[PDB]
Motif scaffolding. Structure first.
Motif, PDB file in Angstrom:
ATOM      1  N   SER A  13       0.831  -1.190   0.000  1.00 11.16           N
ATOM      2  CA  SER A  13       0.000   0.000   0.000  1.00 11.16           C
ATOM      3  C   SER A  13       0.874   1.252   0.000  1.00 11.16           C
ATOM      4  O   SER A  13       1.877   1.323   0.719  1.00 11.16           O
ATOM      5  N   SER A  14       0.488   2.228  -0.814  1.00  8.93           N
ATOM      6  CA  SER A  14       1.116   3.554  -0.793  1.00  8.93           C
ATOM      7  C   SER A  14       0.060   4.589  -0.409  1.00  8.93           C
ATOM      8  O   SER A  14       0.198   5.779  -0.695  1.00  8.93           O
ATOM      9  N   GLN A  15      -1.011   4.114   0.229  1.00 12.90           N
ATOM     10  CA  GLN A  15      -2.116   4.982   0.660  1.00 12.90           C
ATOM     11  C   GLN A  15      -1.895   5.457   2.089  1.00 12.90           C
ATOM     12  O   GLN A  15      -1.094   4.868   2.821  1.00 12.90           O
ATOM     13  N   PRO A  16      -2.610   6.513   2.505  1.00 10.36           N
ATOM     14  CA  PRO A  16      -2.505   6.946   3.899  1.00 10.36           C
ATOM     15  C   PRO A  16      -2.842   5.826   4.871  1.00 10.36           C
ATOM     16  O   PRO A  16      -3.652   4.950   4.564  1.00 10.36           O
ATOM     17  N   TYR A  17      -2.194   5.835   6.028  1.00  9.79           N
ATOM     18  CA  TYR A  17      -2.627   4.962   7.111  1.00  9.79           C
ATOM     19  C   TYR A  17      -2.959   5.799   8.338  1.00  9.79           C
ATOM     20  O   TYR A  17      -2.566   6.973   8.440  1.00  9.79           O
ATOM     21  N   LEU A  18      -3.709   5.201   9.259  1.00 10.84           N
ATOM     22  CA  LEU A  18      -4.186   5.933  10.425  1.00 10.84           C
ATOM     23  C   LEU A  18      -3.086   6.111  11.457  1.00 10.84           C
ATOM     24  O   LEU A  18      -2.391   5.151  11.806  1.00 10.84           O
ATOM     25  N   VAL A  19      -2.915   7.343  11.920  1.00 10.03           N
ATOM     26  CA  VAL A  19      -2.036   7.604  13.057  1.00 10.03           C
ATOM     27  C   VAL A  19      -2.781   8.468  14.058  1.00 10.03           C
ATOM     28  O   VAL A  19      -2.961   9.661  13.836  1.00 10.03           O
ATOM     29  N   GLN A  20      -3.225   7.854  15.144  1.00 11.34           N
ATOM     30  CA  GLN A  20      -3.829   8.608  16.235  1.00 11.34           C
ATOM     31  C   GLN A  20      -2.710   9.132  17.120  1.00 11.34           C
ATOM     32  O   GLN A  20      -1.721   8.427  17.356  1.00 11.34           O
ATOM     33  N   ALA A  21      -2.854  10.381  17.562  1.00 12.63           N
ATOM     34  CA  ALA A  21      -1.828  11.072  18.354  1.00 12.63           C
ATOM     35  C   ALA A  21      -1.460  10.283  19.603  1.00 12.63           C
ATOM     36  O   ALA A  21      -2.325   9.724  20.285  1.00 12.63           O
ATOM     37  N   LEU A  22      -0.159  10.223  19.873  1.00 13.59           N
ATOM     38  CA  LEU A  22       0.375   9.493  21.019  1.00 13.59           C
ATOM     39  C   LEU A  22       0.011  10.113  22.355  1.00 13.59           C
ATOM     40  O   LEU A  22      -0.204   9.414  23.334  1.00 13.59           O
ATOM     41  N   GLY A  23      -0.038  11.434  22.405  1.00 10.50           N
ATOM     42  CA  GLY A  23      -0.298  12.081  23.684  1.00 10.50           C
ATOM     43  C   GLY A  23       0.972  12.423  24.443  1.00 10.50           C
ATOM     44  O   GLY A  23       2.038  11.821  24.233  1.00 10.50           O
ATOM     45  N   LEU A  24       0.835  13.400  25.329  1.00 14.35           N
ATOM     46  CA  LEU A  24       1.951  14.023  26.023  1.00 14.35           C
ATOM     47  C   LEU A  24       2.761  13.015  26.832  1.00 14.35           C
ATOM     48  O   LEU A  24       2.199  12.158  27.533  1.00 14.35           O
ATOM     49  N   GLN A  25       4.085  13.101  26.704  1.00 10.17           N
ATOM     50  CA  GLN A  25       4.973  12.157  27.367  1.00 10.17           C
ATOM     51  C   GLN A  25       5.698  12.776  28.547  1.00 10.17           C
ATOM     52  O   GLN A  25       5.893  13.993  28.582  1.00 10.17           O
ATOM     53  N   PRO A  26       6.120  11.937  29.513  1.00 12.40           N
ATOM     54  CA  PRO A  26       6.977  12.427  30.595  1.00 12.40           C
ATOM     55  C   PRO A  26       8.319  12.911  30.031  1.00 12.40           C
ATOM     56  O   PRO A  26       8.623  12.638  28.870  1.00 12.40           O
ATOM     57  N   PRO A  27       9.113  13.649  30.836  1.00 11.41           N
ATOM     58  CA  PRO A  27      10.427  14.094  30.384  1.00 11.41           C
ATOM     59  C   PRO A  27      11.345  12.935  29.970  1.00 11.41           C
ATOM     60  O   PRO A  27      11.360  11.881  30.610  1.00 11.41           O
ATOM     61  N   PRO A  28      12.077  13.117  28.869  1.00 14.51           N
ATOM     62  CA  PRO A  28      12.978  12.120  28.309  1.00 14.51           C
ATOM     63  C   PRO A  28      14.325  12.128  29.020  1.00 14.51           C
ATOM     64  O   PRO A  28      14.608  13.023  29.817  1.00 14.51           O
ATOM     65  N   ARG A  29      15.136  11.129  28.719  1.00 16.96           N
ATOM     66  CA  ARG A  29      16.546  11.121  29.086  1.00 16.96           C
ATOM     67  C   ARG A  29      17.309  11.809  27.952  1.00 16.96           C
ATOM     68  O   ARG A  29      17.388  11.285  26.829  1.00 16.96           O
ATOM     69  N   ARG A  30      17.863  12.982  28.244  1.00 17.80           N
ATOM     70  CA  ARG A  30      18.572  13.756  27.223  1.00 17.80           C
ATOM     71  C   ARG A  30      19.846  13.044  26.787  1.00 17.80           C
ATOM     72  O   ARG A  30      20.474  12.310  27.568  1.00 17.80           O
ATOM     73  N   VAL A  31      20.215  13.249  25.531  1.00 19.53           N
ATOM     74  CA  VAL A  31      21.320  12.517  24.921  1.00 19.53           C
ATOM     75  C   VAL A  31      22.677  13.047  25.381  1.00 19.53           C
ATOM     76  O   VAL A  31      22.914  14.249  25.391  1.00 19.53           O
ATOM     77  N   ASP A  32      23.547  12.124  25.777  1.00 20.79           N
ATOM     78  CA  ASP A  32      24.956  12.404  25.953  1.00 20.79           C
ATOM     79  C   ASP A  32      25.636  12.025  24.641  1.00 20.79           C
ATOM     80  O   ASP A  32      25.814  10.847  24.328  1.00 20.79           O
ATOM     81  N   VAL A  33      25.993  13.036  23.858  1.00 23.92           N
ATOM     82  CA  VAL A  33      26.488  12.789  22.497  1.00 23.92           C
ATOM     83  C   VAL A  33      27.820  12.061  22.539  1.00 23.92           C
ATOM     84  O   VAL A  33      28.091  11.216  21.682  1.00 23.92           O
ATOM     85  N   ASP A  34      28.632  12.344  23.557  1.00 26.12           N
ATOM     86  CA  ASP A  34      29.911  11.670  23.727  1.00 26.12           C
ATOM     87  C   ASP A  34      29.716  10.155  23.815  1.00 26.12           C
ATOM     88  O   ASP A  34      30.376   9.381  23.104  1.00 26.12           O
ATOM     89  N   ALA A  35      28.782   9.743  24.681  1.00 26.92           N
ATOM     90  CA  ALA A  35      28.444   8.330  24.863  1.00 26.92           C
ATOM     91  C   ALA A  35      27.904   7.720  23.582  1.00 26.92           C
ATOM     92  O   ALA A  35      28.266   6.595  23.218  1.00 26.92           O
TER      93      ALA A  35
END
Length: 317
Positions: A13-35
Motif C-alpha cells: 500500500s502507498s495509501q494513507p494509514y491511520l495515526v492517532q496522536a500518542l499524547g503528552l509524554q513524561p520528560p525524556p533522558r537527554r542525549v549524551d552525544v559523547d556516549a
C-alpha cells in the motif's frame, strides 16, 4: 536482497494509514552525544544491493520504522514505509555502501536491530561519525512524533518509549546535523503525522496549495543563527499554509513525498518536483503538503538529487 522483487515498490500500500496522536509524554533522558559516539564505534552496516559506485563518494544510510506492535500506540504502516523507501532506493540504484535497518517487524530481510531508544541514538551517531568530503548520508524515520515535558519539546518515540522515554528534536539535530563537516550531504525524511518539527533547521519551504509550476519559489529563513556546516535536506509533511475557502492523522505523507520525488524519471528541479509531489499527496487523500527544510537556502531551480551539494540562493539572507 531484491526488495523490488518482494513487491516492496509496487505491491504494497502507498495509501494513507491511520495515526492517532500518542499524547503528552513524561520528560525524556537527554542525549549524551559523547556516549552515543563512543557506543557507535564498532557498529557497522551492510551493503544491501550492488549498484554502480559514485567515484569519490561513499553512501551510508539509516532506516527506522516503528509499528509499536501490541500496544495502544500501534501503527499499521511505518515498517511498510521503510519497505517502500528501501525498494525505491534500490530501483533508482543508489549505491549504498553500508545500511542499518532498525524495524520492529519480524522476518524483515536486512533488519539490523530493534528501534529502541539506545539503538536509535547510537546508530544516529554511527551514520555521521565517519563522514568525509564527498560523502552522502541518508536517514529515514517513520513512527510516532509527539511532545514531551521538559526537565513542551517535540520528540520521536522509540519502540521502547514506555520504558526508556522519547528522543527530543533538539538531540536529533545534535546527533544527525550538528556534527557533519562541510562538503557532506545528508537527506533526512521524517514521517510523523503529529509533530511539526523541522529539527531546528534554519530554512524552509512549504509547497502549499497556491504554489504553481509557473511561479518562482524560494526558501525562507525561519531561525536566527545556524550550527550546521554540512548540506542537510529534510523532507516532512505539514498542514497546508494556504487558507481554505471552505487528534487523528494520516501517516505516510513524507515517505510518499520522497519516494515520488525519486521515482520521477525526468531530472526536475526541487521547485517543480515539489509541485508534482503536492498534487500526488492531494490525489491520494493525504492531509499534509510537502515541506522541504535545509541548512542552507537551496536554490529551488537546482535539480533534485540525494547526492549533490546545494546551490545556494544568495537572495535569502
Amino acid at each position: 536482497a531484491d526488495y523490488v522483487g518482494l513487491g516492496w515498490l509496487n505491491a504494497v500500500s502507498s495509501q494513507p494509514y491511520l495515526v492517532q496522536a500518542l499524547g503528552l509524554q513524561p520528560p525524556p533522558r537527554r542525549v549524551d552525544v559523547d556516549a552515543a559516539f563512543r557506543d557507535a564505534k564498532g557498529l557497522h552496516g551492510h551493503q544491501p544491493w550492488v549498484a554502480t559506485p559514485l567515484p569519490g563518494q561513499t553512501v551510508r544510510a539509516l532506516f527506522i520504522g516503528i509499528n509499536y506492535y501490541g500496544t495502544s500506540a500501534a501503527l499499521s504502516g511505518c515498517c511498510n514505509d521503510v519497505k517502500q523507501m528501501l525498494a525505491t532506493l534500490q530501483k533508482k540504484g543508489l549505491p549504498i555502501n553500508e545500511a542499518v535497518i532498525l524495524v520492529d517487524e519480524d522476518n524483515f530481510p536486512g533488519r539490523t536491530d530493534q528501534p529502541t531508544r539506545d539503538n536509535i541514538v547510537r546508530y544516529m551517531a554511527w551514520l555521521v561519525k565517519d563522514a568525509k568530503p564527498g560523502d552522502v548520508l541518508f536517514f529515514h524515520y517513520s513512527g510516532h512524533g509527539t511532545q514531551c515535558k521538559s526537565r513542551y519539546d517535540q520528540c520521536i518515540a522509540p519502540v521502547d518509549f514506555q520504558k526508556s522515554g522519547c528522543i527530543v528534536d533538539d538531540d536529533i539535530h545534535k546527533l544527525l546535523f550538528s556534527r557533519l563537516p562541510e562538503k557532506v550531504r545528508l537527506t533526512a525524511v521524517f514521517d510523523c503525522a503529529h509533530s511539526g518539527s523541522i529539527m531546528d533547521l534554519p530554512f524552509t519551504y512549504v509547497c502549499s496549495g497556491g504554489e504553481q509550476a509557473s511561479g518562482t519559489p524560494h526558501m525562507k529563513r525561519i531561525r536566527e543563527g545556524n550550527d550546521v556546516l554540512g548540506d542537510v535536506m529534510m523532507i516532512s509533511g505539514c498542514a497546508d499554509e494556504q487558507t481554505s475557502a471552505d487528534s487523528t492523522g494520516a501517516g505516510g505523507a513524507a515517505t510518499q513525498c520522497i519516494t515520488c520525488m525519486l521515482m520521477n524519471n525526468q531530472s526536475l528541479s526541487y521547485g517543480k518536483l515539489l509541485i508534482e509531489t503536492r498534487d500526488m499527496l492531494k490525489r491520494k487523500r493525504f492531509k499534509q503538503v510537502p515541506q522541504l527544510s535545509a541548512s542552507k537556502a537551496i536554490d529551488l531551480d537546482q535539480t533534485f538529487s540525494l547526492t549533490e551539494m546545494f546551490s545556494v540562493d544568495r537572495s535569502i539572507q
